[PDB]
Design a protein around this ligand. Structure first.
Ligand SMILES: CC(C)CCC[C@@H](C)[C@H]1CC[C@H]2[C@@H]3CC=C4C[C@@H](O)CC[C@]4(C)[C@H]3CC[C@]12C
Ligand SMILES: CC(C)CCC[C@@H](C)[C@H]1CC[C@H]2[C@@H]3CC=C4C[C@@H](O)CC[C@]4(C)[C@H]3CC[C@]12C
Ligand SMILES: CC(C)CCC[C@@H](C)[C@H]1CC[C@H]2[C@@H]3CC=C4C[C@@H](O)CC[C@]4(C)[C@H]3CC[C@]12C
Ligand SMILES: CCCCCCCC/C=C\CCCCCCCC(=O)OC[C@H](O)CO
Ligand SMILES: CCCCCCCC/C=C\CCCCCCCC(=O)OC[C@H](O)CO
Ligand SMILES: CCCCCCCC/C=C\CCCCCCCC(=O)OC[C@H](O)CO
Ligand SMILES: CCCCCCCC/C=C\CCCCCCCC(=O)OC[C@H](O)CO
Ligand SMILES: CCCCCCCC/C=C\CCCCCCCC(=O)OC[C@H](O)CO
Ligand SMILES: CCCCCCCC/C=C\CCCCCCCC(=O)OC[C@H](O)CO
Ligand SMILES: CCCCCCCC/C=C\CCCCCCCC(=O)OC[C@H](O)CO
Ligand SMILES: CCCCCCCC/C=C\CCCCCCCC(=O)OC[C@H](O)CO
Ligand SMILES: Cc1cc(Cn2nnc3c(-c4ccco4)nc(N)nc32)ccc1N
Ligand SMILES: CCCCCCCC/C=C\CCCCCCCC(=O)O
Ligand SMILES: CCCCCCCC/C=C\CCCCCCCC(=O)O
Ligand SMILES: CCCCCCCC/C=C\CCCCCCCC(=O)O
Ligand SMILES: CCCCCCCC/C=C\CCCCCCCC(=O)O
Ligand SMILES: CCCCCCCC/C=C\CCCCCCCC(=O)O
Ligand SMILES: CCCCCCCC/C=C\CCCCCCCC(=O)O
Ligand SMILES: CCCCCCCC/C=C\CCCCCCCC(=O)O
Ligand SMILES: CCCCCCCC/C=C\CCCCCCCC(=O)O
Ligand SMILES: CCCCCCCC/C=C\CCCCCCCC(=O)O
Ligand SMILES: CCCCCCCC/C=C\CCCCCCCC(=O)O
Ligand SMILES: CCCCCCCC/C=C\CCCCCCCC(=O)O
Ligand SMILES: CCCCCCCC/C=C\CCCCCCCC(=O)O
Ligand code: NA
Length: 390
């Protein structure tokens, strides 16, 4: 058995490196949102809350994890707090990630009433509530669901702990049924599955809306061909009645030129419709040919800006789903190991070095979020450069 301080020195040094990187990167995230007003929206208010929890990981959780790895003597309820405070920050992260996904779903499913529904003041109240719930969930062991009533008295005396103290070890004080049933299944796994379902609805909604923009555009062009090769006044009326419905369906600085374009489009369809109802088929086809001018000058531009906006919303949702996916990737090994500890008492406990590896991997998550915003969000990246240069 090698001396514990050799392996502990590597673990501590890595933990301190992660703490420094988590603090620096996420203080930069908060600084960027504080200065740049283009970054000041509801989505980024949860981003800041998410970054604040990552800051507290390096300031408190990582020093707590270094402390509780030594198994020092402590009063059980005080030992419970340094054991469970990281569960509060992990819970806070989950609420912020679920809020970001829900916020993006509202922006893409009901964009007309997004600003009136999702406001900045309601977001700050939600964030306050989620932090209160995160403390209550994460510090539930301090409410009585703990093993302080049955202290390992042999381990406490072997380390010279005083009366009323225990050897502060996570799996000694935190019950494993809490970690698996309450923390993992109820408070971690179910919300992550809810995020997955929200993102699936987001990408399904975007794909359908792009589909609708391509259908109405093709409906417009196909009915134009029908009018050209028609032979009576009834075929022209049938095609124009479809375009007028598709134009009004599609109508539902640049907002003034696009409203003018659809006023021309629907108006010209009406001109050709009246000429068709009068039996003037040749005059109706010529009036419908003026629609091509309106299409190339106004309607084709609306379809490309609407296509561009939806593509930006997909990219933004993909970036947010990457954040929530890496969170699961970084925390699931720790939760899976707890499942083996709890559900298989005949299996040997996962080796200590694998425990150290899982703990470090979970802490690393507090570093990766500032890199995703830099590589995937131009507004964050450009603000990051201006902060670092200045
Ligand atoms: C705002 C920031 C600075 C507050 C930080 C407070 C932290 C460092 C304090 C608050 C509660 C404290 C714990 C309270 C109770 C005990 C039991 C004792 O037998 C060992 C110390 C221990 C485990 C303390 C460790 C330090 C502790 C966790
Ligand atoms: C989250 C994604 C990346 C998958 C992570 C897989 C990890 C967490 C899984 C895969 C294989 C698993 C191990 C398989 C076998 C054993 C031996 C058993 O006596 C203790 C648990 C232990 C050591 C498991 C720990 C968890 C484990 C290492
Ligand atoms: C959808 C996914 C990500 C949810 C998380 C998967 C978890 C809950 C699953 C995946 C692998 C599973 C483990 C596979 C093997 C064993 C060994 C068995 O003797 C006890 C149950 C236990 C320990 C399982 C517990 C539940 C488990 C850890
Ligand atoms: C005791 C420990 C206390 C908590 C310390 C933890 C995090 C502090 C930093 C939190 C984030 C601060 C940045 C706030 C911000 O950026 O706000 C922008 C604003 O929304 C634009 O209108
Ligand atoms: C003893 C240990 C104590 C450990 C410290 C406890 C920290 C708890 C909560 C701080 C959370 C700060 C979250 C900051 C979010 C800021 C924000 O979301 O701003 C929205 C904006 O104001 C909308 O207009
Ligand atoms: C902005 C700065 C915020 C404050 C940062 C504080 C750092 C916390 C580290 C260790 C505390 C836990 C150490 C517990 C040691 C107990 C040893 C003992 O009790 O014997
Ligand atoms: C903000 C500034 C925070 C400074 C205190 C943080 C850690 C000190 C080390 C933790 C105490 C270790 C003492 C254990 C012992 O002495 O036995
Ligand atoms: C922003 C401020 C961040 C402050 C970060 C402080 C980092 C130093 C932590 C030392 C924990 C030492 C744990 C000692 C465990 C008990 C030792 C013992 O006596 O056994
Ligand atoms: C959802 C809102 C949550 C708000 C807060 C919920 C109420 C917890 C308050 C005090 C319990 C303090 C327990 C102190 C430890 C007693 C010993 C023990 O619980 O074992
Ligand atoms: C997501 C939630 C699904 C959670 C599924 C939870 C399935 C629980 C099965 C179970 O707890 O079995 C106990 C067994 O007797 C050994 O203790
Ligand atoms: C959704 C994940 C559900 C995971 C459910 C895992 C249940 C594991 C279990 O029930 O284990 C029984 C035990 O092995 C009996 O000895
Ligand atoms: C080896 C080592 C251990 C701990 C104790 N510690 N913390 N967090 C945990 C979890 C957990 C958190 C979230 C989901 O699971 N699980 C278990 N078993 N121990 C934990 C702390 C530091 C080290 N190095
Ligand atoms: C990505 C996840 C982090 C990758 C870097 C991993 C580096 C080493 C982790 C810390 C190793 C400490 C060994 C612990 C051995 C022991 O004392 O039981
Ligand atoms: C731009 C960032 C520049 C560098 C930032 C700080 C780098 C921190 C690197 C590791 C610090 C490790 C401190 C050594 C303590 C070892 C613990 C021990 O002796 O047991
Ligand atoms: C990982 C961390 C990225 C740190 C980027 C360097 C800029 C630090 C300056 C700051 O903290 O505001
Ligand atoms: C330790 C925790 C550190 C938290 C770091 C986050 C700081 C982010 C910005 C908070 C606002 C700073 C106030 C000074 C503003 C300067 C100015 O506007 O000119
Ligand atoms: C659980 C309750 C936790 C604290 C509530 C703090 C303030 C919340 C009320 C604001 C309402 C809102 O705008 O969402
Ligand atoms: C602008 C958003 C501010 C976000 C921070 C919200 C401030 C409240 C923070 C946590 C209060 C903790 C109250 C304790 C609740 C649970 C008590 C327990 O279970 O032990
Ligand atoms: C795990 C502990 C569960 C605790 C359940 C009770 C906590 C939930 C409390 C209410 C959440 C919503 C608060 C609504 C604030 C209303 C104020 C307002 O609308 O202005
Ligand atoms: C379980 C988590 C597995 C890895 C998630 C990696 C990123 C997933 C989000 C894809 C974005 C669409
Ligand atoms: C354990 C479940 C992990 C779920 C991760 C959820 C984060 C978003 C994932 C991808 C959504 C689109 C595919
Ligand atoms: C590329 C994926 C990450 C690679 C680095 C991590 C490599 C080790 C990962 C875990 C494998 C499982 C190790 C088995 C634990 C010992 C089995 C036992 O005796 O109980
Ligand atoms: C022991 C590893 C310490 C560094 C942890 C962070 C690694 C992942 C961060 C971003 C990778 C660069 C993009
Ligand atoms: C575990 C960490 C996985 C990879 C994080 C680094 C990738 C971020 C740059 C884009
Ligand atoms: Na986090």
């Amino acid at each position: 058995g090698a001396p514990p301080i050799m392996g502990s020195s590597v673990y501590i040094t890595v933990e301190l490196a992660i703490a420094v990187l988590a603090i620096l990167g996420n203080v930069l995230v908060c600084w960027a949102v504080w200065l740049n007003s283009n970054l000041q929206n509801v989505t980024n208010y949860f981003v800041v809350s998410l970054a604040a929890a990552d800051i507290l990981v390096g300031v408190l959780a990582i020093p707590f994890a270094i402390t509780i790895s030594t198994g020092f003597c402590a009063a059980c309820h005080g030992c419970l707090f340094i054991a469970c405070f990281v569960l509060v920050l992990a819970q806070s992260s989950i609420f912020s990630l679920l809020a970001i996904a829900i916020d993006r779903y509202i922006a893409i499913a009901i964009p007309l009433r997004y600003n009136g529904l999702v406001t900045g003041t309601r977001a700050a109240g939600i964030i306050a509530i989620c932090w209160v719930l995160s403390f209550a969930i994460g510090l539930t062991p301090m409410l009585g669901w703990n093993n302080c009533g049955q202290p390992k008295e042999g381990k406490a005396h072997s380390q010279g702990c005083g009366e009323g103290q225990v050897a502060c070890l996570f799996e000694d004080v935190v019950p494993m049924n809490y970690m698996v049933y309450f923390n993992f299944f109820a408070c971690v796994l179910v919300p992550l599955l809810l995020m997955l379902g929200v993102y699936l609805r987001i990408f399904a909604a975007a794909r359908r809306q792009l589909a609708d923009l391509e259908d109405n555009w093709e409906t417009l062009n196909d009915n134009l061909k029908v009018i050209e090769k028609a032979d009576n006044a009834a075929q022209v009326k049938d095609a124009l009645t479809k375009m007028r419905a598709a134009a009004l369906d599609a109508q539902k600085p640049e907002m003034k030129d696009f409203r003018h374009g659809f006023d021309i489009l629907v108006g010209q369809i009406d001109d050709a419709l009246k000429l068709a109802n009068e039996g003037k088929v040749k005059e109706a086809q010529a009036a419908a040919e003026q629609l091509k001018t309106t299409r190339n000058a106004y309607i084709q531009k609306y379809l490309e800006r609407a296509r561009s906006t939806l593509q930006k919303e997909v990219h933004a949702a993909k970036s947010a789903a990457i954040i929530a996916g890496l969170f699961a990737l970084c925390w699931l090994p720790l939760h899976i190991i707890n499942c083996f500890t709890f559900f298989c008492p005949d299996c040997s406990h996962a080796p200590l070095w694998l425990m150290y590896l899982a703990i470090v991997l979970a802490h690393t998550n507090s570093v990766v979020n500032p890199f995703i915003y830099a590589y995937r969000i131009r507004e964050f990246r450009q603000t990051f450069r201006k902060i670092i240069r200045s």
